[PDB]
Design a protein around this ligand. Structure first.
Ligand SMILES: Nc1ncnc2c1ncn2[C@@H]1O[C@H](COP(=O)(O)OP(=O)(O)O)[C@@H](O)[C@H]1O
Ligand SMILES: Nc1ncnc2c1ncn2[C@@H]1O[C@H](COP(=O)(O)OP(=O)(O)O)[C@@H](O)[C@H]1O
Ligand SMILES: Nc1ncnc2c1ncn2[C@@H]1O[C@H](COP(=O)(O)OP(=O)(O)O)[C@@H](O)[C@H]1O
Lengths: 366, 366, 366
């Protein structure tokens, strides 16, 4: 059977019988912005991400998912069309599929999602699972608190002996692009300017390479305020050199104390302590030492030490805390998806065509 | 033969050929309270005490006995099923069994109880004995007044030269949970709150460790009202510290003058003097100096001196009084159960299958 | 003399010489969250509710009372300072004061509460009264069971011939914010999102207008699941339309069977019958037909039928039941406060300056 994650900002897909996905691509949809100056087929009406990332410039770019909510289904159908016919070379009527979703999301999302999977692709069977649960599958633990943070969404689920406390789930719409744009805003301080969608991807790729979190914002600010050398140069695709200095960490700092982004909620560490504090007293000691980090926005170096230092300064003393931060976190959700698809006991749970034909899309509520 | 005490709040059991029981556990039944977020067998439909106390949190807790009356036989049967097959590793058709009961209890309780032991477990023989009598076996006396007090029940039986005076027995439903909840009510004075079945057991464990009886309630109140140090800290399972002060003794005080719990009966010492005053005049001098305390709710420090001071101030002078408070009172009842099962003269007293098959359940009255 | 109710979520105050209070406002404290871009005095360091609700947005909001416990005295002092100097234009040395409180609350609350009224405002005299008793004054009955439920607190007191049974009082911390968050949680089903303190008040105002309790949750669920028209539109302050449907009653339902909020206690109707069952038998016929509802969280339409249906299905038959639901329930408590202050016989009960100067703050325990 086939496992697809349409989680925000990049689709990942392959056979469930494997350890890693087969395709990984930006899910961007792009369209031409000028008339044709020379005759030929070369100008197709639309390009999907794996071409859309190459020809970027003459394309505008739109993201069909924002904050984990589909904004334009007609784009998404094109994306799935690419994933099925062009990449995995597989007929979707042959294989069952399961899909990721964010934990809290407008139910209409599920309804149309499964409607498309039946009424167009004629797929045999379907299931929608929340990402944090699947993340636990990849570690193979049965107790812990999962933190996942992707393009535009963060959430946490506490689970104990395989039971979630639904009253304890939180959203926090802080991550991803909402963080990337803060690098756009501050990078204009040095004078470099970046204005447009095709050009935003350069700043994203910088962020993907040259960023880390300070073990104390105050000391590293005082450091870079001194004449000490901490900057690294970067070269733009045109060969313009950039120097970035005093700013590789003042960016991700805004993931904490997020008043920089103007929000006034709690931040990541607050929300990790506040979720456990919605758990019963006798559970708490067991969720500590089992904070699991997940999703690509945890791949900054230094998050582990910062987070443990913060929580240990915030939680009651005498309680040991241990963050399970493996490598390969970028794949963890899909890895867990692969695991669940293989367990034979799960095979009764797929929604059948027969069920959809009685209940229609709302069957997703069982 | 097998010895089981199903007295309130914890079952105690083992072979009669021993000095102590082999298993002692809280007899609580607990059930899951959320739908499953993760696949597996791990969540069985029900847990008996030895797990139900451990995994508490995701469990709610119910007591199948309350105030000494069985509320749901199907729960008790589950408890016995665990005790027989998993714990004592014994086939019930092989061995006789005897059961404790409180002295006054609705007879239907006995009827169904023994019915289950014959018609389901196919046990060879059965006998029901009152707890105070078994308590005397452990001391090996033939004269005295037994005071037993457990979760939710207290009673006294006078026995003289091995004869009880059934017209002099009294119940007083004051002890145990009825006292523990008064710590729940009062502990909120400092501000801490405790609301649910899994969480009540924390207050029970506090009571089991940090409680004592004042050698004069009035002086120790005046003491703790001054800035003298008498409080002890306790750490909760989450590592929250608790401070308890002025209440390690204001709790068990309510076992006397129980107007604190709003009841208006007599208290324990009253009921010990009033029961003896139902004895004939010529018995009294022999019951004095033979008040035997029994049952775990007597395990507070200070009970001995308080009780003797009260009775000696209340009884007529020139009459010697001596409270026999041995150790192992937590086991005293089961010890006495062990003794009676071994006495060869008793071997005629078991109710046979033949008797139940002639008389039916009322055979329990012989 | 002055009557003040600092019950959670809004202060209410005025002269005892009246039928209703003169000022009623949300007691929220709010503070600026950006540096000043324009010159003037207009930005004071802090705003109390009547501006804090108007200018909300540029303010963050904190509630100085939570669950009936003061969290930051320096905030409360700001609220009382406003109520005395700004609103009532009154010197506190002129008039005695009485204060509402919840029935069970950490005694330290009283000590500091009365300390402030003497040592700062130099008021001549003080008394603290529990809200339910004052509620009975407004009806003028002398027998009944009072149910009061306000922002964040519920409690009940049985009173018979002017005597309470303190051992039968219950708290249940279910109401208020704990309900508001359930509207926040469920409203995201339609897709709307609400994240911040200033924005929470919009969801509160929705709750104040478009909500009712179902005479059977099951039938009304099946009804709204059909294509029948039951939704109502609401307009946001920006003119964004909201549609709410199939959810105007699934909110207050969680005030019963509150497992929706993940709590595992009993709910309101259970706890109302269970409090009476701790009363003596001969009182019961008199507490029935005298359940008096009080506090603003009783202002839902439909409460009467649900409550009467529950108790009548639970209580023994042949027993008359009558819910006294007057209008003006939002003021009943304060009305009674005004009454008690007026009875000349009550005029001996105020704690004098002389007593506080001997005993200090703990004099409130007499
Ligand atoms: N090297 C990196 N450093 C920081 N952030 C990264 C890095 N690589 C990827 N990311 C973040 O993670 C995103 C990749 O997709 P992601 O959101 O992890 O998928 P999923 O939604 O499955 O977690 C990127 O858009 C970026 O926001
Ligand atoms: N250390 C302790 N201190 C005070 N009370 C205790 C302690 N241990 C047990 N208890 C009381 O005794 C109960 C244990 O069961 P118990 O009532 O002794 O059984 P039985 O009814 O057969 O006597 C506990 O629920 C508690 O009420
Ligand atoms: N129109 C309304 N509909 C439903 N509930 C309301 C309404 N107005 C007020 N409330 C409830 O009552 C609260 C107002 O304060 P309240 O709790 O009545 O004070 P008190 O604690 O003295 O009763 C609001 O927070 C809200 O919970």
């Amino acid at each position: 059977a086939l496992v697809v994650d349409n989680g925000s900002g990049m689709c990942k897909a392959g056979f469930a019988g494997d350890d890693a996905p087969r395709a990984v691509f930006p899910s961007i949809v792009g369209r031409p912005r000028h008339q044709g100056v020379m005759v030929g087929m070369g100008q197709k009406d639309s390009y999907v991400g794996d071409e859309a990332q190459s020809k970027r410039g003459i394309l505008t770019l739109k993201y069909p998912i924002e904050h984990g909510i589909v904004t334009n289904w007609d784009d998404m159908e094109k994306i799935w069309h690419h994933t099925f016919y062009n990449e995995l070379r597989v007929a979707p009527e042959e294989h069952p599929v399961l899909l990721t979703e964010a934990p809290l999301n407008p139910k209409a999302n599920r309804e149309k999602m499964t409607q498309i999977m039946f009424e167009t692709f004629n797929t045999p069977a379907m299931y929608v699972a929340i990402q944090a649960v699947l993340s636990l599958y990849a570690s193979g633990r049965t107790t812990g608190i999962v933190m996942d943070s992707g393009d535009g969404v963060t959430h946490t689920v506490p689970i104990y002996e395989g039971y979630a406390l639904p009253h304890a789930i939180l959203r926090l719409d802080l991550a991803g692009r909402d963080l990337t744009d803060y690098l756009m805003k501050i990078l204009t301080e040095r004078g470099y300017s970046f204005t447009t969608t095709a050009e935003r991807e350069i700043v994203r790729d910088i962020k993907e390479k040259l960023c880390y979190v300070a073990l104390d914002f105050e000391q590293e600010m005082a450091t870079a305020a001194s004449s000490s050398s901490l900057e690294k140069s970067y070269e733009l695709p045109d060969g313009q050199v950039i120097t970035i200095g005093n700013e590789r960490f003042r960016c991700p700092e805004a993931l904490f104390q997020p008043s920089f982004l103007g929000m006034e909620s709690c931040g990541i560490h607050e929300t990790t302590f506040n979720s456990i504090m919605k758990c019963d007293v006798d559970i708490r000691k067991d969720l500590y030492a089992n904070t699991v980090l997940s999703g690509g926005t945890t791949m900054y170096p230094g998050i582990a030490d910062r987070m443990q230092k913060e929580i240990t300064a915030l939680a009651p003393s005498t309680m040991k805390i241990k963050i399970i931060a493996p490598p390969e976190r970028k794949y963890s959700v899909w890895i867990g998806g692969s695991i669940l698809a293989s367990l034979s006991t799960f095979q009764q749970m797929w929604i059948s065509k027969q069920e959809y034909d009685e209940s229609g899309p709302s069957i997703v509520h069982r």
